[PDB]
UniProtKB/Swiss-Prot annotation:
Binding site for ATP: K95
Annotated EC: 2.7.1.1
Region (Glucose-binding): 135-161
Enzyme class: transferase
Family: Belongs to the hexokinase family.
Keyword annotations of the record: Allosteric enzyme, ATP-binding, Glycolysis, Kinase, Nucleotide-binding, Phosphoprotein, Transferase
Name assigned to this protein: Hexokinase
Chain intervals for the UniProt region annotation (Hexokinase large subdomain): 193-441
Cellular component annotations (GO), alphabetically ordered: cytosol; mitochondrion
Any single biological process term in GO: glucose metabolic process
InterPro entries associated with the record: ATPase_NBD, Hexokinase, Hexokinase_BS, Hexokinase_C, Hexokinase_N
The Hexokinase domain, residue ranges: 5-452
Pathway where it operates: Carbohydrate metabolism; hexose metabolism; Carbohydrate degradation; glycolysis; D-glyceraldehyde 3-phosphate and glycerone phosphate from D-glucose: step 1/4
């Protein structure tokens, strides 16, 4: 199969629509820097820039036993972390099904069950008893605000959870109360977002870590800023958190560029946005999340069908369905090792009921590569904005999420993206001054380490939040 001229011209067209140059990346990074700055100076810039209330770097010399509680859709995960003091740690964990009848929810049965689980865990791993109370970090992945690290006021339940009387209430004393009633030796000392945990856990084992990044269905970034650079906290901070203090920031930068000033959206991206549940929101996420990569390809193929280029005489009644193509499509297609692209052929015939020619499959494959590479290039603009804003010339960027972990070539695409931005003369990725590395476990390990850092301050009578809180 040699690609017909009319189809080659379309592929060149797709390349012009979807490729992101070095220079464009650099202009996007520049806008991203002042949007991060703006989020730090004011409540409600499009980038939240949420203080995470971690005000020290882990040194890697911390030792001792620390717990984490990771509360999930159908599971509660309880993690014990043993910190070895040399950037090292051992871990063990249990998961507990949350019972059917109490997601539907009394606040007090929810916490009694979480407590009963922690009791079971503590009795199994400390059968002789614990000398001292174990500090616990709580990854609580539901909309919440906190004015100190040892607090989480739930804005709203999510994910089938409908428990009355939790919303508008701090969950920490609710949970702490049931722990005390069971006479379990645990204190709940921190509530975090998982990405904040991804940064701190990775930094403990890897001191070059300068950022924790999630690239999945959702996108998030966390890094350490400095207090003198967080204008929106001026007048709010107690005496022992001064201008020199570090501050962990949970970015929530998915809303970056909602104004649509800098992202190179194509007509296909504009459709995804208009058709989404929230047009004009989540702009950066829409352009980088693995969730939309298949819908992008679908709209493109449908457009080429509609203009006469491809799928002639085919049944497009499945192709016409929004979100029929999930992230597994560009993923499988990029992974297709066959010269004649047989995995691509199977996917389209079987799932979409479309028979393809080899030349169509070559176009489809080129398109998957374009969409995936674009996603990665835009993601690293977030990475480069944090680094450039903070004057980090070298960095380990601790990454997680189903896209970073599972999408074909993702790490090679990101690394080439950084290398083009900074224009390095370095042959191999492993040697890039700024590189993406596999994160440590954020929601588990990360929470327990944060619980460690927080305890250092509390034990000292030192503040971990806004004055008078």
């Amino acid at each position: 199969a040699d690609v017909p001229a009319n189809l080659m011209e379309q592929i060149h067209g797709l390349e012009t629509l979807f490729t992101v140059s070095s220079e464009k990346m650099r202009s996007i990074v520049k806008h991203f820097i002042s949007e991060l700055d703006k989020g730090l100076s004011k409540k409600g810039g499009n980038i939240p820039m949420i203080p995470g209330w971690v005000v020290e770097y882990p040194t890697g010399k911390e030792t001792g036993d620390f717990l984490a509680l990771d509360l999930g859709g159908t599971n509660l995960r309880v993690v014990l972390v043993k910190l070895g003091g040399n950037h090292d740690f051992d871990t063990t964990q249990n998961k507990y099904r949350l019972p059917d009848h109490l997601r539907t929810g009394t606040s007090e049965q929810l916490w009694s069950f979480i407590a009963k689980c922690l009791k079971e865990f503590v009795d199994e791993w400390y059968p002789d008893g614990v000398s001292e109370p174990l500090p616990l970090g709580f990854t609580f992945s539901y909309p919440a605000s906190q004015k100190k690290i040892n607090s989480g006021v739930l804005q709203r339940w999510t994910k089938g959870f409908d428990i009355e009387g939790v919303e508008g209430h701090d969950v920490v004393p609710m949970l702490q109360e049931q722990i005390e009633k069971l006479n379990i030796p645990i204190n709940v000392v921190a509530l975090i977002n998982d990405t904040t945990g991804t940064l701190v856990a990775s930094l403990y084992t890897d001191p070059q870590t300068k950022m924790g990044i999630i690239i999945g269905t959702g996108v998030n970034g966390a890094y350490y800023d400095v207090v003198s650079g967080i204008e929106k906290l001026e007048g709010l901070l107690p005496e022992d958190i001064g201008p020199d203090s570090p501050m962990a920031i949970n970015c929530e930068y998915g809303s970056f560029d909602n104004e649509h000033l800098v992202l190179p959206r194509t007509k296909y991206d504009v459709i995804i946005d208009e058709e989404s549940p929230r047009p004009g929101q989540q702009a950066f996420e829409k352009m980088t999340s693995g969730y939309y990569l298949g819908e992008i390809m679908r709209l493109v193929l449908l457009d080429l069908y509609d203009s006469g280029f491809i799928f002639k005489d085919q049944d497009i009644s499945k192709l016409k369905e929004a979100y029929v193509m999930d992230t597994s499509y560009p993923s499988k297609i990029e992974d297709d090792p066959f010269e004649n692209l047989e995995d691509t052929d199977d996917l389209f015939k079987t799932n979409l009921n479309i028979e393809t020619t080899v030349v169509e499959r070559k176009l489809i494959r080129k398109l998957a590569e374009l969409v995936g590479t674009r996603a990665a290039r835009l993601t690293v603009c977030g990475v480069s904005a944090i680094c450039d804003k903070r004057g980090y010339k070298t960095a380990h960027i601790a990454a997680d999420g189903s896209v970073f972990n599972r999408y074909p070539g993702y790490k090679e695409k990101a690394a080439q993206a950084l290398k083009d931005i900074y224009n390095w003369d370095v042959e191999k990725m492993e040697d890039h001054p700024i590189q993406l590395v596999a994160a440590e476990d954020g929601s588990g390990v990360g929470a327990a380490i944060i619980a460690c850092l927080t305890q250092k301050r509390l034990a000292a009578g030192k503040s971990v939040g806004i004055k008078g809180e």
